[PDB]
Design an enzyme around this catalytic site. Sequence first.
Site, PDB file in Angstrom:
ATOM      1  N   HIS A 148       0.837  -1.214   0.000  1.00 39.93           N
ATOM      2  CA  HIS A 148       0.000   0.000   0.000  1.00 39.93           C
ATOM      3  C   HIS A 148       0.868   1.260   0.000  1.00 39.93           C
ATOM      4  CE1 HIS A 148      -3.507  -2.450   1.168  1.00 39.93           C
ATOM      5  NE2 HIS A 148      -4.223  -1.410   0.755  1.00 39.93           N
ATOM      6  N   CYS A 185      -7.918   0.504   1.874  1.00 39.99           N
ATOM      7  CA  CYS A 185      -7.941   1.034   0.521  1.00 39.99           C
ATOM      8  C   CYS A 185      -7.647  -0.062  -0.493  1.00 39.99           C
ATOM      9  CB  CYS A 185      -6.923   2.165   0.379  1.00 39.99           C
ATOM     10  SG  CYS A 185      -6.880   2.856  -1.306  1.00 39.99           S
ATOM     11  N   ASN A 214       8.096  -3.711   0.544  1.00 42.67           N
ATOM     12  CA  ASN A 214       6.809  -3.318   1.103  1.00 42.67           C
ATOM     13  C   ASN A 214       6.968  -2.689   2.486  1.00 42.67           C
ATOM     14  OD1 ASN A 214       4.211  -3.441   2.339  1.00 42.67           O
ATOM     15  ND2 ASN A 214       3.595  -5.209   1.109  1.00 42.67           N
TER      16      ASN A 214
HETATM   17 NA    NA Z   1       2.893  -1.743   3.173  1.00 45.53          NA
HETATM   18 ZN   LIG Z   2      -5.294   4.456  -0.771  1.00 44.45          ZN
END
Ligand code: NA
Ligand SMILES: [Zn+2]
EC number: 3.1.-.-
Lengths: 162, 162
Positions: free
Chosen positions: A97, A104, A118
């Site tokens: 993300h 999200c 990540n």
């Molecule tokens: Na992440």
């Molecule tokens: Zn987002």
Amino acid sequence: ALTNAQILAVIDSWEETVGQFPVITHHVPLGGGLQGTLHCYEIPLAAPYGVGFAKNGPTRWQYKRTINQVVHRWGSHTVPFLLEPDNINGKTCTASHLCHNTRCHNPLHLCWESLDDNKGRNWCPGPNGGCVHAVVCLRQGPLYGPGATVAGPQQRGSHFVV
Amino acid sequence: ALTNAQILAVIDSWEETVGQFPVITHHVPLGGGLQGTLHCYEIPLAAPYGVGFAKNGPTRWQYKRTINQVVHRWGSHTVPFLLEPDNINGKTCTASHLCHNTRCHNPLHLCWESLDDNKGRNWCPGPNGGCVHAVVCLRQGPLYGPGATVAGPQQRGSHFVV
DNA sequence: TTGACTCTCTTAAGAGAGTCA
DNA sequence: TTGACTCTCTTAAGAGAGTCA
Ligand code: NA
Ligand SMILES: [Zn+2]
Ligand code: NA
Ligand SMILES: [Zn+2]
Ligand SMILES: [Zn+2]
Ligand SMILES: [Zn+2]
């Protein structure tokens, strides 16, 4: 499922459903004293989540589709990358993300990289503070900063050197 | 409970024993294209490890001392910090290798901080590359760099904006 | 009292799969 | 076929505790 056409159809139905998730605006640090704006497409807090989606953990979801009378299921953030290699240098590829917002599912906020890459984005200074990620960060990582170290390196005697 | 004097004696015996570990010179990136040198005091790969030391996992060890007929045991890297607070901001303090060398027990290569602060040093640009850690890094983190992202943010349709 | 093994657990970024209706 | 739950696993930075002689 097996065919590229079947996979594209999965990606297309996933995008259409996530495209109807509520769009929540988040103002975020970019580094360098600058601020930006991200638009996250957030999966609901409780059922129903959307066609094909179900919660398997407090902040874990899965997407499922029935293709050729067989159920196919994926981690809910992995769907954009179904046509990509699932490993890199012998490390599993993970959905990462860029917005640091687990609910999200905006694919414009996701990338596909090792778990180490990540994780490391949590401490990145951000796109206006010195990010060197080749796939650039969207914001400064939430854990960037001086830290709160209780005790530093120290010795009582004279046996050690740096 | 062990007195502060008893704890200092434990720290002193630990330092005496670790100081006799093999000392290995490592050349390391400091950030900013500069190179430095660290001197790690490395616990042996197999038994015997040193007086008081035993292996509880592939790269985990413990230090044990028996005081007034009571056995006391600590994680092998926690001993320098036995007179320090053991939590901060509601987070457990952990031994953090500034040298990123797990077998090293040099207390001049350790600090005492939350697990998040600890992990984050893996991606730090280093003391000559922009480290902002208040207790400064000794070297650039081993995972600093552009990363190896396989796929970036992308959509097939037009359902999303960033 | 000590050494050399044994076992499981924590955290926060991530996963896979089964049971019912 | 689709939905809404249940469970355990992975990784790499870290931990505590038991058994035997
Ligand atoms: Na992440
Ligand atoms: Zn987002
Ligand atoms: Na560390
Ligand atoms: Zn970055
Ligand atoms: Zn070291
Ligand atoms: Zn640093």
